[PDB]
Design a protein around this motif. Sequence first.
Motif, short mmCIF file in Angstrom:
data_model
loop_
_atom_site.label_atom_id
_atom_site.label_comp_id
_atom_site.label_asym_id
_atom_site.label_seq_id
_atom_site.Cartn_x
_atom_site.Cartn_y
_atom_site.Cartn_z
N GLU A 198 0.84 -1.21 0.00
CA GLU A 198 0.00 0.00 0.00
C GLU A 198 0.87 1.25 0.00
OE1 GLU A 198 -2.56 -0.32 3.45
OE2 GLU A 198 -3.81 -1.81 2.44
N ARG A 199 0.48 2.28 -0.75
CA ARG A 199 1.37 3.41 -1.01
C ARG A 199 1.39 4.40 0.16
NH1 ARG A 199 3.37 4.99 -6.62
NH2 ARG A 199 4.71 6.79 -6.15
N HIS A 200 0.28 5.09 0.41
CA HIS A 200 0.16 6.14 1.45
C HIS A 200 1.18 7.28 1.31
CE1 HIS A 200 -2.54 3.25 3.29
NE2 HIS A 200 -1.55 2.37 3.34
N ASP A 201 0.74 8.42 0.78
CA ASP A 201 1.61 9.59 0.63
C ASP A 201 1.86 10.24 1.99
OD1 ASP A 201 1.94 9.56 -2.25
OD2 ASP A 201 -0.10 10.33 -2.42
N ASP A 205 4.29 2.89 4.73
CA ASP A 205 3.69 2.00 3.74
C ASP A 205 3.33 0.68 4.39
OD1 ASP A 205 5.23 4.07 2.46
OD2 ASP A 205 5.13 2.95 0.57
N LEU A 206 2.13 0.60 4.94
CA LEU A 206 1.71 -0.62 5.59
C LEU A 206 1.54 -1.77 4.59
CD1 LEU A 206 -1.17 0.54 7.97
CD2 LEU A 206 1.13 -0.12 8.70
N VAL A 207 2.35 -2.81 4.76
CA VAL A 207 2.31 -4.00 3.91
C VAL A 207 1.39 -5.07 4.53
CG1 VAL A 207 3.72 -5.79 2.83
CG2 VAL A 207 4.68 -3.50 3.27
N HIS A 208 0.65 -5.79 3.68
CA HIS A 208 -0.25 -6.88 4.09
C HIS A 208 0.46 -8.19 3.89
CE1 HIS A 208 -4.42 -5.03 4.53
NE2 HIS A 208 -3.66 -4.00 4.20
N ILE A 209 0.44 -9.02 4.93
CA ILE A 209 1.19 -10.26 4.98
C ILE A 209 0.25 -11.42 5.34
CG2 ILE A 209 3.08 -11.42 6.22
CD1 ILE A 209 3.08 -7.71 6.17
N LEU A 221 6.41 -1.08 6.67
CA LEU A 221 7.44 -1.50 5.70
C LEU A 221 8.88 -1.35 6.19
CD1 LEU A 221 7.67 -0.89 1.86
CD2 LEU A 221 9.38 0.22 3.33
N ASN A 222 9.12 -0.38 7.07
CA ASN A 222 10.43 -0.17 7.66
C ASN A 222 10.89 -1.39 8.47
OD1 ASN A 222 12.76 1.28 8.37
ND2 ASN A 222 11.78 2.11 10.21
N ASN A 223 9.95 -2.06 9.12
CA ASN A 223 10.22 -3.28 9.90
C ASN A 223 10.14 -4.56 9.07
OD1 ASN A 223 10.02 -1.26 11.76
ND2 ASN A 223 8.52 -2.29 13.07
N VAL A 224 9.55 -4.47 7.87
CA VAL A 224 9.50 -5.57 6.91
C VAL A 224 10.84 -5.72 6.24
CG1 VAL A 224 8.54 -6.39 4.70
CG2 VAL A 224 7.03 -5.34 6.40
N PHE A 225 11.29 -6.96 6.15
CA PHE A 225 12.46 -7.32 5.40
C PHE A 225 12.26 -8.72 4.85
CE2 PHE A 225 16.32 -9.98 5.71
CZ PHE A 225 16.95 -9.49 4.59
#
Lengths: 260, 578, 185
Positions: A198-201, A205-209, A221-225
């Motif tokens: 998800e983009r969010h200006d 950027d909250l990613v769905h997992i 997203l910062n914590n996603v790797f």
Amino acid sequence: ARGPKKHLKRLAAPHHWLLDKLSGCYAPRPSAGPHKLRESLPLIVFLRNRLKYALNGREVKAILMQRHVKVDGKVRTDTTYPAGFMDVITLDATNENFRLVYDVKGRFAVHRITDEEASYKLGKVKKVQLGKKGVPYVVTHDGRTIRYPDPNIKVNDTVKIDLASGKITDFIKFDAGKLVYVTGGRNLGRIGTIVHKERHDGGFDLVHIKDSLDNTFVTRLNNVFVIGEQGKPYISLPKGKGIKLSIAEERDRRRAQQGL
Amino acid sequence: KNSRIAIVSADKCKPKKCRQECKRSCPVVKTGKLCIEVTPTSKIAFISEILCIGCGICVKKCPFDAIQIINLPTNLEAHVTHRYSANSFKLHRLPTPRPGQVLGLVGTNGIGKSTALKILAGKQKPNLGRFDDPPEWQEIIKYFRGSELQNYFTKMLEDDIKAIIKPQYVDNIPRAIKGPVQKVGELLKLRMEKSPEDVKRYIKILQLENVLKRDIEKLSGGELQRFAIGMSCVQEADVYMFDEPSSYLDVKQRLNAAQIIRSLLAPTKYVICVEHDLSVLDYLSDFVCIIYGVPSVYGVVTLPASVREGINIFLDGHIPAENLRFRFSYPSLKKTQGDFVLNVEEGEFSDSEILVMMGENGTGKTTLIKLLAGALKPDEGQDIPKLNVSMKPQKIAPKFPGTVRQLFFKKIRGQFLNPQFQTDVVKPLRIDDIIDQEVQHLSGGELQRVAIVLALGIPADIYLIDEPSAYLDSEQRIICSKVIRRFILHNKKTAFIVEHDFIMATYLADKVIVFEGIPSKNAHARAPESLLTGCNRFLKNLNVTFRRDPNSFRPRINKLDSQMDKEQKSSGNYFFLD
Amino acid sequence: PRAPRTYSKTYSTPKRPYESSRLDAELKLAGEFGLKNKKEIYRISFQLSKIRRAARDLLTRDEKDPKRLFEGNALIRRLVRVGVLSEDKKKLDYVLALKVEDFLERRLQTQVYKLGLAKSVHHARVLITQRHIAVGKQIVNIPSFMVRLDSEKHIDFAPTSPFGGARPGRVARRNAARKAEASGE
RNA sequence: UAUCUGGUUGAUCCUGCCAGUAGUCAUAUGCUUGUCUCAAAGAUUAAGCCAUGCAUGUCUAAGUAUAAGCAAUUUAUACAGUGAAACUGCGAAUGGCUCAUUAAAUCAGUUAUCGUUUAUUUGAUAGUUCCUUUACUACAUGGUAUAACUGUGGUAAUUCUAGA
RNA sequence: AUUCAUAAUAACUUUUCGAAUCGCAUGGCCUUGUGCUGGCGAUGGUUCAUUCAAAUUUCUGCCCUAUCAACUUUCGAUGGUAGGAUAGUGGCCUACCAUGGUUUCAACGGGUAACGGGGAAUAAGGGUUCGAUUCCGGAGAGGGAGCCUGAGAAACGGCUACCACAUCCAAGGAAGGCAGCAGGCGCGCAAAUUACCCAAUCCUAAUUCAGGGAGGUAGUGACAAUAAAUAACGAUACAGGGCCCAUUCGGGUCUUGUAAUUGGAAUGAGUACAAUGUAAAUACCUUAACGAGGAACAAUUGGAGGGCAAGUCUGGUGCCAGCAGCCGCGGUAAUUCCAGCUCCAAUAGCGUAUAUUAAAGUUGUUGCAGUUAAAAAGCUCGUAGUUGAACUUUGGGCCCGGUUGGCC
RNA sequence: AGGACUUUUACUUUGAAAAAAUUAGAGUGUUCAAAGCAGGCGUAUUGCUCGAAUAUAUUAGCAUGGAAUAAUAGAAUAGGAC
RNA sequence: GACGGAAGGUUGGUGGAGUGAUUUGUCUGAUAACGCCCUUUGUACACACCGCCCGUCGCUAGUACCGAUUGAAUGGCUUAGUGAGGCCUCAGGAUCUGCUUAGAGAUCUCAGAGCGGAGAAUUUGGACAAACUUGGUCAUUUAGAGGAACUAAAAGUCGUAACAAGGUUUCCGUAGGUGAACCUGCGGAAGGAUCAU
Ligand SMILES: Nc1ncnc2c1ncn2[C@@H]1O[C@H](COP(=O)(O)OP(=O)(O)NP(=O)(O)O)[C@@H](O)[C@H]1O
Ligand SMILES: Nc1ncnc2c1ncn2[C@@H]1O[C@H](COP(=O)(O)OP(=O)(O)NP(=O)(O)O)[C@@H](O)[C@H]1O
Ligand code: SF4
Ligand code: SF4
Ligand SMILES: [Mg+2]
């Protein structure tokens, strides 16, 4: 208060070093290093508390000062050196090798690895810019800049680092259909491949997992790797496999089935 | 626990401006008895001593902060390190034998100091004011735990700190230990262990070079005090103590004694002096540690101070803790013994008048007195005393078992019965204990005061007096001297006074004879001249000078060479403001 | 300064101190089980109180809830392993009921009497507080305990001290040596 | 563990307090005092004053050591075993202590620096300076001092310091 | 999202950097000279990122007070221009120009026995009170102000001056700070030892080998808590249930209590060989040798009219002394005073003060009252504030399809 | 990839973002308990081994469904939507 | 109930009326009842009018406030005047140290002079700014001559103003007077002794 803080008490340090309240006032402040203060883990903590090799700080120092042990295959003699996420701790004690990878509860388990895996590590690219004389470069989560990268490698992607050489042996792109680890916060030490981004200006950027059991969740997203391709993880995962069982399954497996 | 009391005078402590709240809001003033007496007037607020309960209510609500609050000295079964039994002397605090520096320990005479030193040495152990069981060290350690001495005393228990003390008295050490051989020679060699060089340095820097071939018994108490200190010094030990080292000694020879004491201090060793000093304690110690109380009843030791500061507080009185107030003819005879040439000159020994002697130790002032009394001599001519001879001994360590009262019956109490001994001492410091009690257990200034009585006691006028300052301080010295002068001037006598102290000589003196010559060689007694020139003669040879403390009139010896010292050397005067 | 060692009081005093109904009834328990103070009773009623309020807090939420299930099963199983609540009513609604008597029954003071051998409960308490008796190999010296069901059959005299074995004692030493044998010189 | 009870009237029911009641990591104070574990403890008046002692110094294989030090170098008339002192480099801005001021100020959660400094770790990183790179001075690598030190002192005195 | 990263031109530099550094093993080479190359490090070294941070900054919230309704604008108030100054944006500060900004949805002032949070006490639910205090952040090291040095200070176990206190003194000057540890004085209703030690947990250093009252270890410690000794078992003499095999007339296990009548048994508290414990001890945990039968090794602290549990028992006192949180007791028979007997409460712990929470639905939103008990304002208008009619797509199906429980 | 505009809110489910210590609370042998995060297990002879959870965390800021309740509007000079 | 200087002429049982006190029964002259005395009203009394209670006056102790003092002390803010100290600069140059035409006899000072560099005191002007001195200004505790009150009274001295139509019905608002309760006008109310021609 008039400059940097060198001391650090117990309690102020993070919960996932498993520091007992008593047996000391202070805790080992991690030294200035590659990784951040709160996320990383000192070598002393990895030795006396986790592996149970040393008892005192004395013994830890006496182990470190005779070379033997080495993070990234390099001397590393300081006591409170911050060993963080996805680091190879090479020891000469019966050819033992260790990879720091997160657990179910967001801790650093004693996860052994093969001698072949000790060659390489991973790294999340945080920025990619031109340096001096127009030379492009990447920067991992642990500050390991790599000069002359491939133009395919853009921000948020992962890089496989060779340790013996500062080079890019492989790169993996950021989308669904890849095995995707997740660090940081509530959902720390889980795997669920990404469903969609998800983009969010204006940041975040909250990613769905979606894990193997299809218990979906969202993280920042910062914590996603990431890690690898679907059913082909480039690192050997620990016991649990980044799933996270509920308290019911815990009371079934960890205090009923396992008993003699 | 204590007696809190008020004090008043200040810089613009203005009773006229304030509308006197002190008077207006004091509880004792508002229940009959006038404690605080004041008006709208030119003077200060007067406040009593005896009445004031304490409280401190006036202090808070006096408009100016003029009136402070003090606490007076009184026993309260507090601490108590040791007593003897009851209606006897007690002591409360023995303390921090602080190391690496010499520790001054000062007080008016018969206050406990010596006893405390003995306690520190571990010879006369304490008892907490109780009648203890066989070696109860445990209990005493528990009493003075939570403090430094816990360590110290436990070490002493296993003799890992070896003991040594210079005794109070001088005449007892030669008599008790009858050695096989005398001299400095062998008896020093058996005493010393340390090394060969240090002893050479000591005996050399002690400026003796006299008594290397001579027996101790022959030696005068001064050359003997010296030996005592030497025997204490060379003895190999952990602890070091000097119980009143600088008594009846020369002004020049005191300073170098102090600086030999100083020798021992530095490398993790503990040193503990006691002294009744002029201003020679400037060099003796680093940490002065005053003791207060009542003579021969109770004594409390204050925590240590810097030497300068401590001496300055001893004078005024008040301190950060408490408040102890404080403030006809004779011919030219030629006399000999064996290793000496003691010559004398003719003089005018006038009626109804004093006569002052001074000199270096070994200048012959003392044997003269013996010969005048009766001992040996002469081979050619002398003048017998007209009046009945009266004698004072220096070597005082006597033995009359039973009590002092019994010994007082050998004199008489019924002569010039109006005060005399009471005018010496009776109201402030008291004599009750000294008039009772054994002489064996009595201390320095009190024992000395025993001998000051044995003088104006048997019926006699012509008087021989050498070293009364022995074991006395500025409190006990000056008033005693004044009393002596009042005695021999008023009722018509003659007395040959001999002092080492400057204040005890100059406040009395008028005609001054001066001894001159090197020890164990020669001795010349010069005729009585003026007080100034005679004193210069005394001090030109010794090569030391004084400075009158401008506020209080008090002597302060100079530092061998200095800016003022050289002016005095060039001018000549060693005494300002007559 | 380091982190504090935390603490909290186990007894909980009643509201109304002088009451005829409570003072008479509570003292009977103390007389039967042999409790030295009312403090012990209050402690037991405080633990019980905590259990009750916990159960109430579990019951305010709906059935088939993750919170209610897990906690219920562990609370109930805790109350089963100690032996206060038997197997018949393992329902969570029954733990609200309960009583203080069951708790005092489950104490090790009286479980020695309920086994037997110690004759009186007071005597049993004495035996316990004087270092006799043991749960297994491990010796216990405290009247209050809560025996954990499996431990019941293993309760006997300890190897040290008499009855179990070893030496006689002090009084018997004095009788055998100082009195009986000492008659013959 | 969602509780009351005595006090005003000749007796009643009320408004309404008063007193009782239990708690207190809120303190003091009285009396009493055997054990185990565990423990805050000059905050409140007074961020009022303080004797005196101690609390920040610092070395490896690796900056400088003809100490006129120690024990000897047995590879050392370049030192090249150890090593006080001093110079240099770091540290002393962390800590520990108290809360006096301070009310949108500190402060919490929460963003941002595309308005920036960042010793140190950590990873990368200047082959082009003799700008006459035609002689130009050595780059087999050159000069200015100066502490400790030896000795001559100053002052009453402080971890004062003067020349040579 | 950029005048961003970055590059390329025209420039200047009063000059940043580009190792004249140091140690271990000593080789590999060449037409063979103290020749050419040579590994493993350490410390320096400019820029860039990273880390440790630092500094500013967005929004949102704070204790009482209108007998504090207008404040801010002078030598800064709000805004703009341009500069200076900072590592920096920015009235931060200059010169010019403009007349704004805050406010009764409560500014501005005053008070706070106010550092702010994380929390603590109490608890039905909602709340009320406290938070100096072991963690985060802030501020200050007597009061203020200024500054050197370093990356970092406006540092105070650095300096500088003035103010206030205060020390040594030869009067010539010199040195000061505990709101660091331990103490001493003051003030007090109120609080501990000038103890041992870096072995721990960390930190600092050129650094595994040093230093650290950072901290840890003892002591003093009824601030608070946890557990929990202060005595159990028989025999004999009493008023008894009466039980075991039920061969109802055999003897004693369980005994309900009362009995200085008595017999053994088990221990601790305590003394201590040893060992453990520990930096080294003291304790603890152990345990040889000892140590219960009464003034022994004795437990108290408050009450006994009602509230509130327990006395109309015994003598003294005679509205006196006193008790009494409240009501009230005491004028010569006191179930309240003084004692003693017996009893009750809590029980190594209770009582007494002052603060506070609950009960107090006596602050009330949940949840008070206002005819007469305190309380509806003389009445109306009216701005803010609060609140304010209804009405603007329901139903019907068609499938797909997970969750409950029982025959399957 | 996108450009263009969808009257705005409050409200509310879910999610992250949510320092430990404390608070409630899962296992455990501090001998029970306050506690503490240890511990269990072998032929206890060269080893094996689970666990240090979980929730709570008002308001303020974000992302996220939902359209009921409560407001807020486009269009009556139609310089108005297709 | 008791009282009135107000109006008129015994007690339970069961049952109702009430939350009770209690009342009804035990009553107008029939029927919620069945088997000096009284009633109604007023009441601040309830040891019951000898009752309660209101104030002027004397008397012990306190308590605030006012305040003689042109009190006094301590604080923040400030008119005017003065302002150390470092820091920044305009200057200054004690001294130390390089170069050079040039001095001296075959990295030599012996003459000096120029060219520089480092550079202590002192020093003009700035911003910072601790203080000090004068006028104050406000605030704060803090004094305490004597005032004017208020209480707490072991039951005084003079009065009756209220509680019965308290014997001048009682109060409210105001005005005036009074030694003292209060009294007297004006208008209102009744929580009046009238819910009525
Ligand atoms: N053993 C004893 N028996 C009785 N009295 C004693 C004993 N020892 C000391 N005293 C008394 O205690 C007092 C103090 O003793 P001590 O410490 O010797 O005095 P001091 O102060 O040393 N006198 P000095 O040295 O002269 O100044 C004396 O006055 C004696 O009377
Ligand atoms: N028989 C002897 N032979 C040698 N010397 C002797 C003999 N007897 C006495 N002396 C010494 O001769 C000296 C004469 O000096 P003396 O008069 O005693 O001096 P003093 O006044 O005592 N001074 P001080 O020592 O200060 O008291 C003494 O010091 C004696 O010790
Ligand atoms: S002391 Fe205080 S009160 Fe007593 S007089 Fe001097 S000033 Fe006035
Ligand atoms: S001190 Fe106590 S007594 Fe002495 S004057 Fe001030 S008040 Fe009166
Ligand atoms: Mg003496």
